[PDB]
Amino acid sequence: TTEIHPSCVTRQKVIGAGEFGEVYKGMLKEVPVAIKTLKAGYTEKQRVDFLGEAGIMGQFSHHNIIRLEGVISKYKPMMIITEYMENGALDKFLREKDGEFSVLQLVGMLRGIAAGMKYLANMNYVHRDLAARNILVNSNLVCKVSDFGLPIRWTAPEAISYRKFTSASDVWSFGIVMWEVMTYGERPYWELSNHEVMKAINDGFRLPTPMDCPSAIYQLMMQCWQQERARRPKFADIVSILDKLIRAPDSLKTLADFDPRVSIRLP
Numbered sequence: 295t296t297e298i299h300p301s302c303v304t305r306q307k308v309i310g311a312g313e314f315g316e317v318y319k320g321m322l323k324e325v326p327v328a329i330k331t332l333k334a335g336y337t338e339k340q341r342v343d344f345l346g347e348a349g350i351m352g353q354f355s356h357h358n359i360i361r362l363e364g365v366i367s368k369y370k371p372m373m374i375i376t377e378y379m380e381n382g383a384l385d386k387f388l389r390e391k392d393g394e395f396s397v398l399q400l401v402g403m404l405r406g407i408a409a410g411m412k413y414l415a416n417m418n419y420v421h422r423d424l425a426a427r428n429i430l431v432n433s434n435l436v437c438k439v440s441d442f443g444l445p446i447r448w449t450a451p452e453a454i455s456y457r458k459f460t461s462a463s464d465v466w467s468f469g470i471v472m473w474e475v476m477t478y479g480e481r482p483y484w485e486l487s488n489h490e491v492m493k494a495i496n497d498g499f500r501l502p503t504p505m506d507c508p509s510a511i512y513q514l515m516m517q518c519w520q521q522e523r524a525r526r527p528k529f530a531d532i533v534s535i536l537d538k539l540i541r542a543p544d545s546l547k548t549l550a551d552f553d554p555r556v557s558i559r560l561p
């Protein structure tokens with residue numbers, strides 16, 4: 295990580311809360327940045343977790359992972375400073391832009407998220423909280439995997455049941471993210487409670503296709519939701535498939551049937 299001097303950082307507005315501090319938008323000497331602070335009184339564990347987060351983030355160098363600008367560790371409050379993405383988090387972005395993108399644009403966002411996840415998994419970094427709310431979107435529509443902290447309905451069964459978090463449980467979550475993107479940010483499983491979601495999964499039910507969804511994309515998300523972890527695609531498989539679909543874009547014109555929940559009869 296690069297150490298940044300505090301005189302170069304201007305905090306401007308609060309945009310969220312940290313484990314023992316706040317998150318701000320600000321400017322870095324000017325480029326806009328996001329700034330997470332660790333405020334006076336933090337515990338030893340909080341310091342270890344905070345500087346540990348900075349240290350792992352400093353290792354990430356990929357187009358589809360949030361970029362660390364630097365850290366303030368030599369002065370108080372300590373800070374983690376990242377690039378700032380003006381379109382914000384992906385879940386809110388898509389809900390505010392319903393129906394505004396082409397299928398190819400949506401699938402391109404998924405390819406980018408998958409490439410970032412392949413990078414993390416390859417680095418032996420298990421995300422554990424992959425969801426559209428933890429993905430940032432830049433002004434080129436590039437998605438940057440991030441983690442803002444605390445998700446039953448995004449989590450694989452083995453991770454819920456016995457705390458087995460691996461890249462393969464992240465693949466399950468990625469399938470949910472695919473469904474979030476293709477629905478413009480719908481809530482997975484709609485109004486079902488967390489217990490009803492787990493019961494449905496265990497009974498064998500899976501999310502139905504989004505509207506206007508390429509058949510290949512629904513097939514892929516379905517294979518991310520295999521109960522048996524060993525049967526799920528690896529991230530390398532996901533990236534490869536998405537890349538090939540984008541590069542032969544007529545492949546995306548074949549749509550999965552959408553199951554009507556409502557019948558409208560007209561003459």
Ligand SMILES: COc1cccc(NC(=O)c2ccc(C)c(Nc3nc(-c4cccnc4)nc4c3cnn4C)c2)c1
Binds near residue numbers: 311330360
């Ligand atoms: C695999 O990737 C990993 C793995 C492990 C850890 C992390 N850590 C971060 O992701 C992280 C840590 C510190 C910062 C300053 C940021 N930046 C932003 N956080 C927030 C925000 C908003 C509300 C509430 N909380 C946060 N909003 C932002 C940014 C940028 N732009 N915007 C709009 C992100 C990433």
